[PDB]
Design an enzyme around this catalytic site. Sequence first.
Site, PDB file in Angstrom:
ATOM      1  N   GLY A  11     -10.773   1.644  -7.262  1.00 46.54           N
ATOM      2  CA  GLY A  11      -9.746   1.396  -6.270  1.00 46.54           C
ATOM      3  C   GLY A  11      -8.999   2.621  -5.790  1.00 46.54           C
ATOM      4  O   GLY A  11      -9.290   3.750  -6.187  1.00 46.54           O
ATOM      5  N   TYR A  15      -0.931   6.768  -4.840  1.00 47.25           N
ATOM      6  CA  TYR A  15      -0.829   8.210  -5.020  1.00 47.25           C
ATOM      7  C   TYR A  15      -2.184   8.899  -5.124  1.00 47.25           C
ATOM      8  O   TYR A  15      -2.315  10.081  -4.804  1.00 47.25           O
ATOM      9  CB  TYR A  15      -0.005   8.506  -6.271  1.00 47.25           C
ATOM     10  CG  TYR A  15       1.340   7.822  -6.270  1.00 47.25           C
ATOM     11  CD1 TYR A  15       1.634   6.826  -7.191  1.00 47.25           C
ATOM     12  CD2 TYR A  15       2.313   8.160  -5.335  1.00 47.25           C
ATOM     13  CE1 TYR A  15       2.857   6.185  -7.183  1.00 47.25           C
ATOM     14  CE2 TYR A  15       3.540   7.525  -5.320  1.00 47.25           C
ATOM     15  CZ  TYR A  15       3.804   6.538  -6.248  1.00 47.25           C
ATOM     16  OH  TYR A  15       5.019   5.894  -6.241  1.00 47.25           O
ATOM     17  N   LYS A  33      -6.629   7.880 -13.067  1.00 48.81           N
ATOM     18  CA  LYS A  33      -6.013   8.048 -11.753  1.00 48.81           C
ATOM     19  C   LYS A  33      -5.859   9.529 -11.450  1.00 48.81           C
ATOM     20  O   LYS A  33      -5.262  10.273 -12.228  1.00 48.81           O
ATOM     21  CB  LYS A  33      -4.634   7.369 -11.694  1.00 48.81           C
ATOM     22  CG  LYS A  33      -3.924   7.505 -10.339  1.00 48.81           C
ATOM     23  CD  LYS A  33      -2.470   7.029 -10.395  1.00 48.81           C
ATOM     24  CE  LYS A  33      -2.230   5.769  -9.556  1.00 48.81           C
ATOM     25  NZ  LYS A  33      -2.283   6.014  -8.076  1.00 48.81           N
ATOM     26  N   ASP A  75      -7.650  -7.320 -11.224  1.00 47.07           N
ATOM     27  CA  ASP A  75      -6.269  -7.342 -10.757  1.00 47.07           C
ATOM     28  C   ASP A  75      -5.907  -8.746 -10.283  1.00 47.07           C
ATOM     29  O   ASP A  75      -6.789  -9.573 -10.039  1.00 47.07           O
ATOM     30  CB  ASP A  75      -6.070  -6.325  -9.626  1.00 47.07           C
ATOM     31  CG  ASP A  75      -6.733  -6.752  -8.330  1.00 47.07           C
ATOM     32  OD1 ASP A  75      -7.980  -6.744  -8.258  1.00 47.07           O
ATOM     33  OD2 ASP A  75      -6.006  -7.093  -7.382  1.00 47.07           O
ATOM     34  N   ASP A 116       7.804  -1.075  -7.104  1.00 49.04           N
ATOM     35  CA  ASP A 116       6.756  -1.507  -6.183  1.00 49.04           C
ATOM     36  C   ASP A 116       5.844  -2.558  -6.800  1.00 49.04           C
ATOM     37  O   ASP A 116       4.618  -2.433  -6.755  1.00 49.04           O
ATOM     38  CB  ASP A 116       5.926  -0.305  -5.719  1.00 49.04           C
ATOM     39  CG  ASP A 116       5.090  -0.618  -4.493  1.00 49.04           C
ATOM     40  OD1 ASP A 116       5.435  -1.571  -3.760  1.00 49.04           O
ATOM     41  OD2 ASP A 116       4.085   0.086  -4.264  1.00 49.04           O
TER      42      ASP A 116
HETATM   43  C1  LIG Z   1      -4.497   1.515 -14.349  1.00 44.77           C
HETATM   44  C2  LIG Z   1      -5.666   0.613 -14.430  1.00 44.77           C
HETATM   45  N1  LIG Z   1      -6.248   0.261 -15.613  1.00 44.77           N
HETATM   46  N2  LIG Z   1      -7.295  -0.569 -15.481  1.00 44.77           N
HETATM   47  C3  LIG Z   1      -7.393  -0.761 -14.159  1.00 44.77           C
HETATM   48  N3  LIG Z   1      -8.339  -1.554 -13.610  1.00 44.77           N
HETATM   49  C4  LIG Z   1      -8.523  -2.038 -12.296  1.00 44.77           C
HETATM   50  C5  LIG Z   1      -9.560  -3.044 -12.151  1.00 44.77           C
HETATM   51  C6  LIG Z   1      -9.885  -3.637 -10.899  1.00 44.77           C
HETATM   52  C7  LIG Z   1      -9.166  -3.234  -9.744  1.00 44.77           C
HETATM   53  N4  LIG Z   1      -9.477  -3.814  -8.408  1.00 44.77           N
HETATM   54  O1  LIG Z   1      -8.809  -3.427  -7.434  1.00 44.77           O
HETATM   55  O2  LIG Z   1     -10.403  -4.642  -8.322  1.00 44.77           O
HETATM   56  C8  LIG Z   1      -8.141  -2.253  -9.860  1.00 44.77           C
HETATM   57  C9  LIG Z   1      -7.786  -1.627 -11.124  1.00 44.77           C
HETATM   58  C10 LIG Z   1      -6.649  -0.567 -11.127  1.00 44.77           C
HETATM   59  C11 LIG Z   1      -6.006  -0.162  -9.799  1.00 44.77           C
HETATM   60  C12 LIG Z   1      -6.771   0.625  -8.862  1.00 44.77           C
HETATM   61  C13 LIG Z   1      -6.188   1.002  -7.622  1.00 44.77           C
HETATM   62  C14 LIG Z   1      -4.859   0.609  -7.305  1.00 44.77           C
HETATM   63  C15 LIG Z   1      -4.097  -0.163  -8.225  1.00 44.77           C
HETATM   64  C16 LIG Z   1      -4.663  -0.551  -9.474  1.00 44.77           C
HETATM   65 CL1  LIG Z   1      -3.685  -1.484 -10.552  1.00 44.77          CL
HETATM   66  N5  LIG Z   1      -6.080   0.085 -12.113  1.00 44.77           N
HETATM   67  C17 LIG Z   1      -6.398  -0.044 -13.469  1.00 44.77           C
END
Ligand SMILES: Cc1nnc2nc3ccc([N+](=O)[O-])cc3c(-c3ccccc3Cl)nc1-2
EC number: 2.7.11.22
Length: 283
Positions: A11, A15, A33, A75, A116
Amino acid sequence: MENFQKVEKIGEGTYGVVYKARNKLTGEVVALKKIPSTAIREISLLKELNHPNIVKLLDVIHTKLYLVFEFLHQDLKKFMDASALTGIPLPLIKSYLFQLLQGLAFCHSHRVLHRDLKPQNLLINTEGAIKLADFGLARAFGVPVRTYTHEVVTLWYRAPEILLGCKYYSTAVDIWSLGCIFAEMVTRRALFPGDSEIDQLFRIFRTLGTPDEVVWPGVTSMPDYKPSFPKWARQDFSKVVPPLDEDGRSLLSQMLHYDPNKRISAKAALAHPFFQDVTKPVP
Ligand SMILES: Cc1nnc2nc3ccc([N+](=O)[O-])cc3c(-c3ccccc3Cl)nc1-2
């Protein structure tokens, strides 16, 4: 970073991009990230603020800024869409709200705001847990109008005091966001889907009533308040989130109180009778 094998992009955060990745040494699967010392200090402090309903910050690497997070597979936004035709069962909605409030209650006891909250940064697993991601990063980096990919940052969950120009808002802003999300799980539709700051405000006003000095002392004095705001009358919650029961409607109305000082706290919400029969179903 050489310690990590990127598995796939999962994703785009506000940021920076987020990858699923494996630790080359431990084989540990994590979310990575990829994104100023004041920000580094703030983030470092967040590393000790651990809670089961907060996505664990495993490490910070600066050389570019990388945040290594606990990984979860899905998510809430995707889950809500996938559930849109049948609706998420009330017991799971109740369980998710209950857990999210525990997460808020913990961080707020440490005087950290999320700022947020939205479905896209709530993550779930097969065991029925739900967790908040990105907690505390807004204070570290600020909340932009656009993401790093120029995508519009959603206004749908933004508390009215933020929209009205307050510089020093409180933990109450997170309770507002969570109430909006609560209503959305129940009705399967965004409560206040504004497409600009003023449209966001007016959507709030059209449902909850245009706030005045009776409901919100000091409101007409706020920076972006205009006496020329149209005066809409408040609607019944019976119309807003049918067919939620009265315990649920009672809690939601308290989470959406205009006055931030009167808006229910996370800790107080956990004691609300709505959670008397709370359980932990698996999705
Ligand atoms: C931190 C964290 N740890 N595990 C995570 N797993 C995910 C699994 C599925 C998806 N999705 O979008 O299908 C997003 C996430 C995200 C995420 C990515 C971009 C913007 C925001 C978020 Cl929260 N972050 C994660």
